[PDB]
Structure formats: C-alpha cells, structure tokens
Amino acid sequence: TVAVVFSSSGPPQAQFRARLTPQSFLDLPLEIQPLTVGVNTTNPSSLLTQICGLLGAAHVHGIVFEDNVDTEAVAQILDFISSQTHVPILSISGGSAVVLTPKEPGSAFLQLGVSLEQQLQVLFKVLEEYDWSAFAVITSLHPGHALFLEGVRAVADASHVSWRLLDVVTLELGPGGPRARTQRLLRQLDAPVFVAYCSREEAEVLFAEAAQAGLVGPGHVWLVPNLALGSTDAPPATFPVGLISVVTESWRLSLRQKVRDGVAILALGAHSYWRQHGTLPAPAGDCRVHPGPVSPAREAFYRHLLNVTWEGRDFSFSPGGYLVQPTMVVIALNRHRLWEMVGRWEHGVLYMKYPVWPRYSASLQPVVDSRHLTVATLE
C-alpha cells in the first residue's frame, strides 16, 4: 500500500480531493490501495506529526511527496524522517525537487532533478553551437558557490575546444548594504557572454543593478542554472528578454500527471520485485520506537527499486539521490514576456529552434545588424 500528500494550494486542493476519490487508476500491476493526506501549512511540527502518526496509524509501505510554493530548506526534514523511520519516500516537483548532495548515510530519498555537473554541461554544449566563448563568471556569496566554481574550473581544463576564459568575480548580494563597491566593479567589465549563479532575491538585486549600470542591452547574453527562476509559472519583472536556462522535462505537465508517474514508478518496482521474492516487502514503520540496524531485505528492495522503464521515459538512479541519463529542455524568454521551448537534449546530442541567435532591440523589431552573411551552395 502507498499514500500521497498534497500541500499549499487551496482551490486546487478541491480538485486534488476530487481526483483522490477514485478507487484506482486500474493500470498498475498491483493491488495497492492509495490513501491521501492534506496539510494546511508547511511547518516542522505539523509535518512531523502528520507524517509519522499517519504512517503508524494504518500500516503503509511507501509514501510520495507533492510540492508547494517552493520555499527552500524543506527536503532536510524529509531526509531526517527517512533516516529515522527507514521508509523510502519520493519527491516529484517544486523547491523540494532540488538536489541535496551529501545525503544521510542510511537514507533513501530519491528526489528527481539534475545534479549541478549535469545541469552545467548543457550550457557548455549550447555555447559551442554558436561559439561565443566569453566566460564572464559572476557568482554571489551563496552556500553552493564552492562546488560550482570547482566544477566549472575542472570542466574548462578537460573540454574539446580552447574556451578562453576572461575572469571570475564574486560579490556580496545581501538585502541591504553599501552598493558602491560592487556597482563600480561590475561596470568595469567587458564580455559578450555572462554566466551567473545565485538565488531569487539575489537574481533580482543583481539584475536591477546591471540594468542600472548599462549591461542589459542587445549586445550581451545571460546564462543562469535551474536554481534561479523560481516559480517557473510566474514571470517576474526586471528580467531582460533573452535569459537562457535549463530545466527538466514534464515542467508543463499537471500535478495529477506527476503523482501518477510516481505511483507508476513504485508500482513497477513492486511488480519487478514480487517475481524475485514472491510477495511484497515487509512494511517497517514505527514513529515512536525508532529501531533498526542495517536490514538486508529492505536494502535489497531499495536496490531493486533503482531501475525502471516504460511510459516513454527513463529513471535510472545513481548512488546519489538523483537520476542519470536525463532528458531536459532548453528554455528562454520570448519577445512577449513568456516562456517557450528552444532546444532539446536526448542521448548526448543537442538541437536548436533557430540556426542563429536573434537578439532583440528595445522594440519588437529585431536588428539584423552587420556581418552574419547568408551564404548558399548546393551539392
């Protein structure tokens, strides 16, 4: 048996209850009966009680999570839960769907996303199709900067092409302070391509400052990873058109589709399992007692869970709590302040919607500009 939880969307939660009311989807090769839980607000005590009490009340085997307004520092609690009660969980979306690299030793979190190295290789692959090679790296004083800088430095030295790098800059991006030191320094730059890694508020403040000190015209291009851009459904202001980022697949899908996907993953795991051992794995659950050394049966179950298929996709998990061989899409800001697809990535080859990068003037009319001569030939 499995359970599901919904979080932090009132009017949608009515549709969530309506879609929970069906007996089953009647497709999964299992006879597990779901159960639903709904929590008013996301808080530590609330989540702790509503998860372990529910888990110990009705003898469940597995649980799957659902996202929220995407406020940070929420996955750690679920990781602690997994460590304590030794029960596998699964995240599907939202801010909780961000990689948490040094997970607890004995846990099994299985949050789907993209690791920073994989999340970064795509920008270098797309930066070679047009071959700009400027590399003005801007990083804020954020906790995750150390791994990012090390990864980019390591990749730069083992790549295919020369990749001339201009310089690296770090700056304080706090909510309040004297701007002058960063403001004068930022304008002391010259590079056609920028890559920046920071948080949402840091993105707002840096982008406003750059727009103030004339670095947002049609000549430059910005690259940001998935850690930024927040909602993915609400377009904020002050964003210069042309921002490029990379996000995973199924972003435009529905919550019902995502929860069905998670249910299918766990069901296919169980379906592959019962053939090996003959029955469902024993459900270990105890909020209060907290026993358990390393258990070989549940470890074997976790091993058998790591590889699935079907539904026109793939989910192969590494020892780290993240999937490998991923399928994501390049996204960009269209001329009407709206997100749209640009490029796909399937099996280590890259594509693009356009053969050239448009770039935009102040008005809707683009500037063809000089150079980039069109040349024709035939076989």
Add this chain to the structure above:
Amino acid sequence: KIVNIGAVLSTRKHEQMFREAVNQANKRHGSWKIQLNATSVTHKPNAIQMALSVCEDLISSQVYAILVSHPPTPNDHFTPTPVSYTAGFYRIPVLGLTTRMSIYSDKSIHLSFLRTVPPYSHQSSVWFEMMRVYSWNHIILLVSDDHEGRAAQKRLETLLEERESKAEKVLQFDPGTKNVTALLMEAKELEARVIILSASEDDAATVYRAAAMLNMTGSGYVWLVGEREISGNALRYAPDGILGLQLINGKNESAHISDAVGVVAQAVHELLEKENITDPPRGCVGNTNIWKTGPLFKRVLMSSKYADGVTGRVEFNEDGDRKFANYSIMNLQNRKLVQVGIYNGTHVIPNDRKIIWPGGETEKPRGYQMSTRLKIVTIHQEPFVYVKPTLSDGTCKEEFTVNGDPVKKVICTGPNDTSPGSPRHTVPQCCYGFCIDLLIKLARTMNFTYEVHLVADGKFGTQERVNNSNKKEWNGMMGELLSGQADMIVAPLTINNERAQYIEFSKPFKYQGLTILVKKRITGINDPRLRNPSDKFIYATVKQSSVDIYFRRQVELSTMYRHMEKHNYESAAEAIQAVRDNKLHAFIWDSAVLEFEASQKCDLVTTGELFFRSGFGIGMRKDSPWKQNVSLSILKSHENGFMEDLDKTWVRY
C-alpha cells in the same frame, strides 16, 4: 529589552553553570540598558520526540540562540542533528561545543552552524607541519572510505600539492570490515617507512592487529595517528608506539559554555545598535517566515573578537572554525602517554623530553628506506626480444652462438595467453635478445637484481577516453608502469609528446624512423594511391599504437586514419603473414623492425625513405634516482662500442 537564550544539555548541574555564567555576564557588562534571561532543557532519547519538545519549548519563549554539547551516550550523531535541522528552518543560529563530526562543516546542508572546536580535518594540516619539522618527504596514505576520511585526505593533498611533491599510493578500504590483510599485502611491496592512519575507533584495533601479525611494526617503519585512534588502542590491543595529538580542554564542557555566553552577550549589544531590531517571537503556527536579519546577525557573530581568553582566546575562521589553536604531542611508550612537544599557531616546540620509536633505536630513524630490487616489463618484439618455450627440465636449451660465445638467457614469466579470448594460464619461459643483453650489461655496471615479467595485454600503451566518465585512463604497458607494478621499462619505446608529460625517457640509444612494407609506386608522405583511398591499396596498422595518435594529430591524414581505424590487427606477426597472403596491402611502423624482417624473411621489400625521426629509450617513473646514473652510463657504453658490436651480432646477418 529582555533577551532570552536557550540551551540543550544533559548535566543537571550544568544548568546552574549557565545560570552563574549569565549572572556574571549581567554583573560585568551592561548598564541600565538591556537584561538577559536564560533557560535550558535536558536531552531526551527519542530523537523525534526531542525535536518536538524542543520546538514546543521554543514556542514557549522568545529565544535567540541555542547551545548544545555532547551527552555521554555513544550514539553521537543522534543528539545534534534534530535541533540543528529544526533551527535551520528558522535560521536561528546554533553553536556546538563538543561535537567534532565533519558533515556539519558543509554550509549547504546546515544553513547556520558554528563549531567552537576545530574538526578532525585539520589534523592533516598539523600532520603536514610535523612532516616539515622532521624532514620527511615521502608519505604513504592509509585512510578509510568514509566521508570524514575523504574530507581529511582532500585537505591533505591540497596542503601537500602546495609543495607539489605529490603523495604515494593512497589506499581505501571499506568501513566496518575485517580481514584487511590484502591492503597491507599490496602496500608491503612499495618502498616507504612512514605510514599515517585515520579511521573509526573500533576499526583501529582491527587494522592494528594485522600490522603486528605481518611484522610491519618492526624497526624502520614508524606510526603516527590522531586522537581518534588513541583511546581504543590501549583498551584491548596493545600499541607499539604512535605519535599523536590531543586538545587542551577536551570534554571539559565548562569553559566552552562560558566563552559562548560571553561572545553572544558581546554580540547582542552590537545587534541592538544596528537600528533594525526585528523581534522573532515564537510563531510555530502560521509564522512561515525567516527572522528578517539572520544573515547579518550570523555575519557579525562570525566577526566577533575574542571576548576574554581566560582558558584560551577564541576567534572564528571563514568556514566557521577556530584558527590559531594549539595541540600537545604525545608518545606511546610503556603504555603511559607523556607530553613531548607543544604546537604553536604554525610551528611546533619540543620541550625537554626524549622520543622513542618502535624499533628501540634512540636516534631519529632515517626514512625513505632505499631499496635494491627492481621490477621490469617488456613486450613481444621481433628484432629485440626473443621469447621461446622453456625446455622440459625447467630451463631452456643452452646453445652456443657461432662466434665463440653463449647467448645469455633469463627466465621470464609472461602471461602465456594471447588475445582477450584466451583465459590467463601463465607458464615460466625464458627470454633473450638485444634488449636483454643491454640490461645484463647494466647488471655488470651496478648492483640490482632484475625480475623480468612480460606485459599483460600485448599493447604498447596509449591514452584512451573512459567510456562515459570524467577522466581519461591509460591502457597497456605504460598504464601498468604508472600504476606501480614496476619501476622501469626496457622495450623499443618511441619517445613522443604524449608520454613525455609523465615518464622521463632519457638518452636515446638507437635512432629509427618510419617505413612502409609492400610485397615484391608509393610515397610515404603523400602519394595519389595513399592520400586518396580506394578498394585497392588498403592502409592498416596495429591498433593502440603511437602511430594511431600521430595520425590522429592530422587534418586530411586525419581522414586517412579515420578510415584506417575500421581495420586493425593485434600483432605484428599477423601483418607479416598477411603481407605475403596479400589480404593486407599496406603496413606502417618503425623502420628497424621492418628492415630486419625484410632482411630475414625474403621476397618482401620496404618502399620509400623515412618520413619521420624519433628515438628508442628506457623509461622511468618521474623523480626516480636511477635516471641520472643510467643516462650517464649508457653514453659511456655507447662511446666504448659494445652497443655497436652487438649490432652486427643481431642486426646485420
């Protein structure tokens, strides 16, 4: 103007200690401006229940900071984690005093956390200092595979590659396992006399006992470890001498609380002066927001100067540790620890004591354990090294050369298996030839006993990109040399850019170029038949060879190599047979081998002049002592003419 702080402890009297400390803080600092309250709760075993109780207590008060210590229970990791996580969701700072785990040093997972004692990691830095003071250069690294182990090692190679001398082979073994004899058996072959260890307390006795069993604890070899392995050693498995270290006020838990209360009381005034005092209060239902200025509070707290040293001046490092600390060096003789030297901020100061090493020699032992036995690898090669089956007795036929001398022979193990299809079988054979004579000459020149064993897979060696990986991996004889199996290569090796980065080949002893074989209008550099390919005149060569890289460094000859890579042989003999068989049209590598083969096996000729220049030479691992003398001696031998004399015996016949 009432500021409340909390703390989680276990000693019922320690709450009175905190109360006395805050009373002293009120009596010392402050003047009719702000008063500070205090309260604390005792730890409870059920971790989740402890978290719930702590968050409810925070709900019952307007706390600003949390302070925790080590309870006596052996489940060390259990106590700090829940309060830390439930604090991270609010960014309320927490300071630990007696928890030294390394996972808490990663700012990504624990948002706000400060440790008042240096972690286990900087033992690597003090180890580097101790290596500097005692003039020790080569160190073997024996660390476990746990997260603490990799962090400690990482700091170590950073501070060592600061000198860029690099470390010897680093050995990783799984935690919580026994029968670790294999790792030490592998280490025993290598030459080193200083060994360093860092692991779990229980595993220390396990790894210790095997050392006594394998008598590695004799003289010469020397031990040194951190405090982690100090306690469990004397418990049940007697030591044999170990340099170590400890902290001054370890596990006192009295000075630390005073220091932390002092520093937070110093910080609160500066915070109140910041003109933006947003009160947290205890919203545990609906107050889903962060205390608005936590980042600035943490930033200024990290910058706090030492309030009062008392027991010791305390500051904070950039990562969140305490820089400029001290350690006491101890020794393990007669099962009674004694101080021998005192660590300063950077340097170490001995103090009128006598140091003893496991052997019993009073004088400081000399490291680097210079060796005398050498390993050598070689490959099958037509004109340079003959390999022939041994005779039935165990040696092989002791024939006589025509020119009144016996052809010297040596016993070579070899794999006795060809191609990846055939499984490993092995059989001792005997080897002889030009290079073997060159080697046995060196045996007359200096003192060392060779043990020749042939190559594994029969490939000369190239650099290949690992399939779906980050780093390229070497393959073949060069890879075996770089791994550490042997320390020299005596084979017809070409010198090129790809090899010169790692292994220093010196003083070439025989020059050679490149030619092409045909059976009997081709130009080697560029010919219409070869520059433009067809169904006839197929160009092919042996795979995983230097010529592969050389052709891979071209432009249209790059396309030539691209269509050549579709075909590949695994040995020279196959090509020699095919040239007669006319199935293969062309063949391209080193001039000397092909010239000798054409001289011996008639009806075959080489076409075109040499289009390249190179040299053959021995290769050693970098920074090896033998290189200077072997290069010096080979030139004298060449000047004398013995190399010239051997040629007519083996090249011109």
